Design a protein around this ligand. Structure first.
Ligand SMILES: CCNC(=O)[C@H]1CN(Cc2ccc(Br)cc2CC)CCCN1C(=O)c1cncc(Cl)c1
Ligand SMILES: CCNC(=O)[C@H]1CN(Cc2ccc(Br)cc2CC)CCCN1C(=O)c1cncc(Cl)c1
Ligand SMILES: [Br-]
Ligand SMILES: [Br-]
Ligand SMILES: [Br-]
Ligand code: NA
Lengths: 303, 305
């Protein structure tokens, strides 16, 4: 029993974190095989940040303008290139701790673990979701750029996020490991200013039932259309048939039809909790996916 | 910016997890140097668990009764003993990945990271607190026994918890790594209930400081209070007493924000008496009590390991 924000064990990613220096700037890089990946804004001065021309900034650099430190060891850079908004530094040592890995670009609503790092050294691990507005609500300070997000299903590290910047509202923006930003954002200090992830809230209500609580259910059902008309009034994302399909295994394990759980959520939005909690929370939680619930919860419902 | 429940990086601990088998039971062990530590209840059959005589049950066991697997490698058991509620298995191989470590017994209110493991394999990491009633609100399934909790203190893994059992209410009980239980619990399948829990006051204050650091200020007010008056309110609301030591421990956060602890205590007093009036703090509608003062400083200052 129990239900926690549960990250992946971080060791496989810890063994890949390095420090990258260009000029007076230091940030984190990801060392996989003989390549180090990092945000390309490492090549910018403070002045460069409003309207950088990365091609013009990069052409002026040699390999030896980049320093890479792995623990107490300097790695020699023997090539460099830019792919979208990431810099790739070829180094003369392959990382012996490289895990089995892949790069995946995720969709809004998906979750991942973040290993927050400073100066190439891991500080902590926490769970995040890609918000509907393509930001993440991270916890990041000066020096955190190049920290990554990942999942480790089936003993393969799937890297899905690299941290690039904090927006004025205090939320976070970054890229996939091919250097393409999530959302409309750009690696420029220019103005570039969310909803609740409905499918995740439903998943978490299923978790609550699996773990033994049913107080929030009701005798009603809903059409999908009526559910969306109501939920959108509370700034919830539309629930699609794909979402309904993804909830199928949790529905089967609990005996609660997806549209019946939708009816329960409609009523929770109308009524509140009447002083109760669900899985320890007094608000509806939206950063657990259906897959995350199946990962963490028992396969047997506490009936 | 931002504030998350944050665990320590788990890699140093991952390299210590092994699988221990005794008869039909498999659970997790912690492999440090040439010793594997696990719950002593691994030696019990279901019948034994109802009223075990561990002295006698251990006498009936030999080295040959235990199997230890580290990944795909069998470690040969060459000695065994128990210390309190922990079984110690001496193995033929020292763990080459043994980190610098200590065994530390923590106090109620302190937090730690849990590496949840199954079949000797790490599955997930989360942050917990030792509750005032000496339980933890963990997340554990069948096979999780022997999972450990830890902090990293400077350069050193401080192991503080080993998981033994789930109580009827769904919360968790276990020992320090010297096998001493937290709380009035025993490693027997008999009726057991924790005391009514209370809220960890010093941690709530730490989290209000975190909220201020992160720009959430609506609950500040012109008032102060005394330690005596504050504790009358704490007691009324099922909060732990605030001691002068707690005030001292909050010193760095008080210094960083410029808000005296007793000033913040007046905020908390008003929140307890009036509720939040529909507002949230750091996204929560509850007063969060599983961040220590040090947890707030660690996260707000970017301490690495
Ligand atoms: C808090 C302002 N700083 C940052 O956002 C970042 C990134 N910044 C560039 C930046 C900045 C705003 C925008 Br819009 C675009 C761009 C892209 C050109 C340079 C300094 C490093 N830097 C950080 O170290 C950092 C990261 N995450 C959280 C925090 Cl508090 C700091
Ligand atoms: C859910 C019942 N199971 C458990 O509590 C434990 C421990 N149990 C013994 C037990 C049980 C309750 C008490 Br009181 C005392 C004792 C004597 C120590 C044996 C089976 C292994 N076992 C687990 O694998 C396990 C762990 N954490 C969460 C979950 Cl769901 C399971
Ligand atoms: Br996805
Ligand atoms: Br995968
Ligand atoms: Br909450
Ligand atoms: Na005040």
């Amino acid at each position: 029993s129990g239900f926690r924000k549960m990250a992946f064990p971080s060791g496989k990613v810890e063994g890949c974190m390095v420090q990258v220096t260009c000029g007076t700037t230091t940030l984190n890089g990801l060392w996989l095989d003989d390549v180090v990946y990092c945000p390309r804004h490492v090549i910018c001065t403070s002045e460069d940040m409003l309207n950088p021309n990365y091609e013009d900034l990069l052409i002026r650099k040699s390999n030896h303008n980049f320093l890479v430190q792995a623990g107490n060891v300097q790695l020699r850079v023997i090539g460099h290139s830019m792919q979208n908004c990431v810099l790739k530094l070829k180094v003369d040592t392959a990382n012996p701790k490289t895990p089995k890995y892949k790069f995946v670009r995720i969709q809004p609503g998906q979750t991942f673990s973040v290993l927050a790092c400073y100066n190439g050294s891991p500080s902590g691990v926490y769970q995040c979701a890609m918000r509907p507005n393509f930001t993440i609500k991270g916890s990041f300070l000066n020096g955190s750029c190049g920290s990554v997000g990942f999942n480790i299903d089936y003993d393969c590290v799937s890297f899905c996020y690299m941290h690039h910047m904090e927006l004025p509202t205090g939320v976070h923006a970054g890229t996939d490991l091919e250097g393409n930003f999530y959302g409309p954002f750009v690696d420029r200090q220019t103005a570039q200013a969310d909803t609740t992830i409905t499918v995740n809230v439903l998943a978490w209500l299923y978790a609550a039932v699996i773990n033994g609580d049913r107080w929030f259910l009701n005798r009603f059902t809903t059409t999908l259309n009526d559910f969306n008309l109501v939920a959108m009034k509370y700034n919830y994302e539309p629930l699609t048939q794909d979402h309904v399909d993804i909830l199928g295994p949790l529905s089967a394990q609990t005996g609660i039809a997806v549209l019946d759980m939708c009816a329960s959520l409609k009523e929770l939005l109308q009524n509140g909790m009447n002083g109760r909690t669900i899985l320890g929370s007094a608000l509806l939680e939206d950063e657990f996916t259906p897959f995350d619930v199946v990962r963490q919860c028992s396969g047997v419902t506490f009936q």
